[PDB]
Amino acid sequence: MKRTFQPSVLKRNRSHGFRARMATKNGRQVLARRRAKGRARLTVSK
Amino acid sequence: AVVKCKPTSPGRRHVVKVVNPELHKGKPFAPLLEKNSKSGGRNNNGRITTRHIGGGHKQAYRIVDFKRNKDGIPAVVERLEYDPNRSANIALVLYKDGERRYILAPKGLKAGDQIQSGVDAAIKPGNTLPMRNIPVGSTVHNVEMKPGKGGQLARSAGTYVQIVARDGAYVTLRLRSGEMRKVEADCRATLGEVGNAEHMLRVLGKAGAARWRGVRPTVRGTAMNPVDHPHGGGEGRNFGKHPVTPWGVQTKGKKTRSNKRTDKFIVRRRS
Amino acid sequence: MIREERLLKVLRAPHVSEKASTAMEKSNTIVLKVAKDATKAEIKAAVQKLFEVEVEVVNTLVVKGKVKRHGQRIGRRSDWKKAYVTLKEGQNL
RNA sequence: AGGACCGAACCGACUAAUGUUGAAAAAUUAGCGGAUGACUUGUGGCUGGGGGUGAAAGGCCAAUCAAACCGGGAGAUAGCU
RNA sequence: GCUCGCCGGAAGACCAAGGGUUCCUGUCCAACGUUAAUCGGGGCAGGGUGAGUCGACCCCUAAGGCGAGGCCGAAAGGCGUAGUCGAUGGGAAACAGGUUAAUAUUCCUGUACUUGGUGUUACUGCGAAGGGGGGACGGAGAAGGCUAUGUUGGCCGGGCGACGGUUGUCCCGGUUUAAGCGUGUAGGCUGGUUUUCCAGGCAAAUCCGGAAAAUCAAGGCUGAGGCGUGAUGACGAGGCACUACGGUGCUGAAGCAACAAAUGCCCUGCUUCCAGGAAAAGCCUCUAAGCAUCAGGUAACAUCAAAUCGUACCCCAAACCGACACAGGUGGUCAGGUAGAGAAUACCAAGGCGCUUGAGAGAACUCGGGUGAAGGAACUAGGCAAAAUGGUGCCGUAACUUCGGGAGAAGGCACGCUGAUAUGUAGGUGAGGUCCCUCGCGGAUGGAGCUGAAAUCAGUCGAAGAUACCAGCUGGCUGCAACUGUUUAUUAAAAACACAGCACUGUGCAAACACGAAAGUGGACGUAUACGGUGUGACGCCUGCCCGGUGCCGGAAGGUUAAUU
Ligand SMILES: [Mg+2]
Ligand SMILES: [Mg+2]
Ligand SMILES: [Mg+2]
Ligand SMILES: [Mg+2]
Ligand SMILES: [Mg+2]
Ligand SMILES: [Mg+2]
Ligand SMILES: [Mg+2]
Ligand SMILES: [Mg+2]
Ligand SMILES: [Mg+2]
Ligand SMILES: [Mg+2]
Ligand SMILES: [Mg+2]
Ligand SMILES: [Mg+2]
Ligand SMILES: [Mg+2]
Ligand SMILES: [Mg+2]
Ligand SMILES: [Mg+2]
Ligand SMILES: [Mg+2]
Ligand SMILES: [Mg+2]
Ligand SMILES: [Mg+2]
Ligand SMILES: [Mg+2]
Ligand SMILES: [Mg+2]
Ligand SMILES: [Mg+2]
Ligand SMILES: [Mg+2]
Ligand SMILES: [Mg+2]
Ligand SMILES: [Mg+2]
Ligand SMILES: [Mg+2]
Ligand SMILES: [Mg+2]
Ligand SMILES: [Mg+2]
Ligand SMILES: [Mg+2]
Ligand SMILES: [Mg+2]
Ligand SMILES: [Mg+2]
Ligand SMILES: [Mg+2]
Ligand SMILES: [Mg+2]
Ligand SMILES: [Mg+2]
Ligand SMILES: [Mg+2]
Ligand SMILES: [Mg+2]
Ligand SMILES: [Mg+2]
Ligand SMILES: [Mg+2]
Ligand SMILES: [Mg+2]
Ligand SMILES: [Mg+2]
Ligand SMILES: [Mg+2]
Ligand SMILES: [Mg+2]
Ligand SMILES: [Mg+2]
Ligand SMILES: [Mg+2]
Ligand SMILES: [Mg+2]
Ligand SMILES: [Mg+2]
Ligand SMILES: [Mg+2]
Ligand SMILES: [Mg+2]
Ligand SMILES: [Mg+2]
Ligand SMILES: [Mg+2]
Ligand SMILES: [Mg+2]
Ligand SMILES: [Mg+2]
Ligand SMILES: [Mg+2]
Ligand SMILES: [Mg+2]
Ligand SMILES: [Mg+2]
Ligand SMILES: [Mg+2]
Ligand SMILES: [Mg+2]
Ligand SMILES: [Mg+2]
């Protein structure tokens, strides 16, 4: 049966990529939170 | 020409169509075309603000000249064309200087007819004139609200306005709704009635015909749950309440006009 | 004109394999490991000047590094550029 | 001509059996409905939580819906076990 | 290796997405693989992806996103102009053969094509952020001309048969060739040309639009296919010689015709219908400031450049989405033979597989099937399930009806093979030759050859001729909903929702209404024959009484009455 995850690189990057996060103050706060925690991978971009 | 369809299929049994042989059969005049994409009733917030709109056939917009301010140049009717954007038909007119324009087609108009606009124009159907220079009692259409702004009243198929009185700087108009309204005498109007008066005699016959025109189904308030309509709820068919809009305003008889700015120009309500 | 140090830095190493030897024999084509940023023109000029030969065409491709494992961790070798540079059958490099 | 007829693809899901620590967190087999249309499908886009969307079942909104998910107030309060 | 079995509109082949080395070679079998494992998509090491023409990148825009100033908003921010991004759409160019263990339209061989910088020379009014043309567009349907492709014959090479016959009206195999270039055909559309004038194209125009005279009457654009060349080349059955047993080198015959024929092409065509069917750029053309023997444009020739990134492998799946080597899901293209209406179905071709536990036995019972005496719904909540009907042609077919239907109503007859009509018919296609011409892919003739239904009569075998697969059960009464549709993803598909039609009611446009602290936006580039809300629900016959209560609407005499003062 058709499941919930249907990958698409363009849609993934546009939804959750670095530039999508950087475009809004809430996204920049997401990035700041993840830097403070110390994540090795900030976003889906890499 | 009102033609009913033979009941060869259930969806064709009640279909009544308006077919005009005189209408053009080819493509429209391209330099007067412009795209008009659809909205689905959604505004710039993306929210549905007018229900029951969506789908339908792709349509091009035809730039129709509602101002008719090319004064003193005679023009000839080239052809009458179907317009998907409005009930009324439109006419392609060629001016003596080689300029081409679309106008609303009034009743009795045909290819080759002569039209003119201006103070010096004759009192013939299709001619645009200031209402100051149009006799009292004349039937007109494509009426202006403000001088030089463009026709805004009596534009639908078969519509018209009569000039009931003329006092000073204002004329009195009897609109299709029955309302008597005052407009400045310098506002222009077109002589005659809008054509295609049989437009209201057509019978769609099937639901898909309404879908072709971009109308989505209407769901009755009593058929849903109380959480999303005041009318909703009940074990079986129950109503027991005064009818209202989905937002709680009484929808049977309550007046909603509130415009004190334009109240002074209203001689009498439609009644 | 591409400067001297650019030409001296673009060429890294020659490729060696059965395909490389076959290319050299059959089609007079040497295969090289070139700089990741080296373009076809820079490669052509560098082979013309450092090896003293004549080139008519250069074909390039980027090799992707393999994912390997050393002591249960994860690692990836670097990508590198490979060049098929042909000579005009009169130099014998 | 047709929201026309029979019938594959395709979309669906009326019956029965099987399966029910399944081959499968909704399927298989034999039958079944639509199949030029209010059809079906690819790609991209828009609408955000007392809000959206709904040919309306309180349906659907990432296996979660009479108020999603994540984090915070927070060690809420619990005459109860 | 030889047999056997399975798929073959797929269980074969190829793209896109998604994944990322799973691809090839050597080596290992600890763990992983539902068993073993010498094997593997497992471990380890090495190798492998070659582009001016493919795609991305690039130019252009859609929905939509962002948005200098700006408008608005406690702040954060919202919206939006000029702009700038954004494909799922528009815009230049390459084909055939050979080659690797693994790449190829990328490498090699042969033959082409496109754009741009230049330079020389010949002639010359060039030039935009402007005008104009063009790009540029729906559904359905029908015919003709074709091709891919198939079949048969001819031709060429081979064969003379494990068991009766097989030198023939016999068996097997092959019979292939692209882009480009020349020809401009079936067919589609459009009258051509030159002068004179102009309230139009925000200014100009020699361009587009309009008006008028003159004259010629065929000009222009489009266009599958074929023919010729490309090609005295390539490839090609088979033999010749090696063989490390994988395969390698040389050589290589014939390489034609007729018929049949697409859902593909001509065709973005034609016909018709109403629901009336993107944008912008590339391209062509016109002028403006400006430059004006310079610059720039058109042409011929020569040289130079075409960068960068991707290219391995899976790709309807053991490699993507489902925790699995999971009976699930996943867009597009290719599409052979016999029978068949068919992309159904059966058996096969090319090609790919036998599904990663086996060996015995032949109890109950469970699952999936086959047959069944006599009876035939007696079963059961219920004919659930099963059994049955099933095709084509012809005959024939009731009540009722909105005159379309009901209707495939019901029911019945024929069906194989052989011969003859007719050494192959009705037809389809069509060479030779003959005549003509505004001569070529031409008009008339003409019929060789090929292909070819259906019918009738006669005979004949079987229990049975729509023999397999495939493929309606039928009729009578009645409730509900008019109907096609929609719905509780995952216990409810219905009488529920929707519907066309009807009515009430609001709404005069800066419309009512809705999303919004607002600016704005939708309604709508619509204007009362329109738009919103509510209820009813095709059609036919109709829709009676009550305004006391609640609500709504109208009114303003009188009483009561806020801030204020
Ligand atoms: Mg509505
Ligand atoms: Mg309605
Ligand atoms: Mg309900
Ligand atoms: Mg309520
Ligand atoms: Mg009740
Ligand atoms: Mg009651
Ligand atoms: Mg090359
Ligand atoms: Mg149908
Ligand atoms: Mg049906
Ligand atoms: Mg469903
Ligand atoms: Mg099934
Ligand atoms: Mg059907
Ligand atoms: Mg309920
Ligand atoms: Mg859910
Ligand atoms: Mg709550
Ligand atoms: Mg607290
Ligand atoms: Mg607690
Ligand atoms: Mg074997
Ligand atoms: Mg690996
Ligand atoms: Mg392998
Ligand atoms: Mg072992
Ligand atoms: Mg094992
Ligand atoms: Mg391996
Ligand atoms: Mg490349
Ligand atoms: Mg935009
Ligand atoms: Mg700003
Ligand atoms: Mg904005
Ligand atoms: Mg752009
Ligand atoms: Mg694209
Ligand atoms: Mg390969
Ligand atoms: Mg052919
Ligand atoms: Mg088709
Ligand atoms: Mg490949
Ligand atoms: Mg398996
Ligand atoms: Mg599977
Ligand atoms: Mg599908
Ligand atoms: Mg099949
Ligand atoms: Mg197994
Ligand atoms: Mg048994
Ligand atoms: Mg049994
Ligand atoms: Mg049986
Ligand atoms: Mg038996
Ligand atoms: Mg029996
Ligand atoms: Mg019996
Ligand atoms: Mg019986
Ligand atoms: Mg009984
Ligand atoms: Mg009993
Ligand atoms: Mg049954
Ligand atoms: Mg049965
Ligand atoms: Mg009853
Ligand atoms: Mg129904
Ligand atoms: Mg139905
Ligand atoms: Mg359910
Ligand atoms: Mg169900
Ligand atoms: Mg407004
Ligand atoms: Mg009802
Ligand atoms: Mg009813």
The residue extents of the domains of chain B are 1-113, 117-194, 195-271
Integer angstrom CA distances of residue B210 from B3, B54, B205, B218, B222 = 19, 11, 9, 12, 23
What class has domain B195-271? few secondary structures
Closest CA to B171 of B156, B190, B185: B185
Residues of chain B (164-203) having a beta carbon less than 7 angstroms from strand D: none
* Distance in angstroms (rounded) separating the CA atoms of residues A42 and A28: 11
Question: Quick count: other Cβ atoms within 10 Å of Cβ B91?
Answer: 26
The answer to whether some atom of strand D lies closer than 7 Å to the beta carbon of B84 is: no
H or E segment and range at residue C19? helix C18-27
- 8 Å CB contact between C10 and C35: yes
How many Cβ atoms are within 10 Å of B208's Cβ, its own excluded?
A: 9
Neighbours of ion ligand 4 (CB under 5 A): B 226
**Strand E positions closer than 7 A to protein CB:** 17-21, 43-51, 62-66, 76-77, 79-80, 87, 100-102, 106-108, 132-134, 136-137, 198-201, 209-210, 273-279, 306-311, 320-322, 328-330, 402-404, 482-484, 496-501, 504-516, 520-523, 525-539, 550-554
Elucidation technique = cryo-EM
Q: Which nucleotide is nearest to B5 (CA to C1')?
A: D1
Amino acid at C66: K
B97 within 8 A of B84, measured Cβ to Cβ: no
- Report the domain count for chain A: 1
Q: How far apart are CA C32 and CA B179, in angstroms?
A: 90
Listed residue (B62, B37, B39, B34) closest to B49, CA to CA: B39
Q: How far apart are CA B156 and CA B195, in angstroms?
A: 9
Taking the C1' atom of every nucleotide in all shown strands and the CA of B54, the nearest one is: D38
Helix (H) or strand (E) holding A28: helix A25-37
Which nucleotide comes closest to C41 if you measure CA to C1'? E307
Q: For chain C, give every domain's residue range.
A: 2-93
* B131 contacts B193 by C-beta, under 8 angstroms: no
Residue of B145, B198, B196 lying closest to B175 (CA atoms)? B145
CA separation (Å) from C89 to B37, B243, C5, C25, C86? 64, 95, 28, 11, 9
**How many helices (DSSP H) and strands (DSSP E) are in chain A?**
3, 0
Q: Which nt is closest to the CA of B211, judged by C1'?
A: D38
Q: Strand D: which positions are within 7 A of a protein CB?
A: 1-4, 24, 26-27, 37-39, 43-48, 52-58, 62-63, 66-67
Q: Which residue has the tokens 């007109």?
A: B140
Options 3.40.50.2300, 3.30.200.20, 3.30.70.330, 3.20.20.10; CATH for C2-93 is 3.30.70.330
Q: Which CATH class, in words, describes the domain spanning B1-113?
A: mainly beta
Residue span of the structural domain in which A39 resides: 1-46
**Residue B196 CB neighbours (<10 A):** 24
Closest CA to B10 of B148, B206, B204, B202: B206
Query: Which residues sit opposite C63 in a β-bridge?
Result: C80
Q: What is the DSSP letter of B204?
A: -
Beta bridge partner(s), residue B244: B250
How does A10-19 read in b/e, with b if 16+ C-beta sit within 10 Å?
eeeeeeebee
CA–CA dist B228, B51 (Å, integer)? 14
Q: Which amino acid is located at B248 in the chain?
A: G
- To the nearest 10°, report the CA torsion of B173, B174, B180, B181: -30
Which chains would you list as touching A if contact means 3+ CB atom pairs under 8 Å? Answer: none
Residues sharing a CB contact under 8 Å with residue A24, sequence separation 6 or more, in sequence order: none
Resolution of this structure in Å: 2.2
Dist. CA C85–CA C40, nearest whole Å: 9
Quick one: which of A42, A36, A41 has its CA closest to A21? A42
Rounded to whole angstroms, the Cα distance separating C29 from C47 reads 12
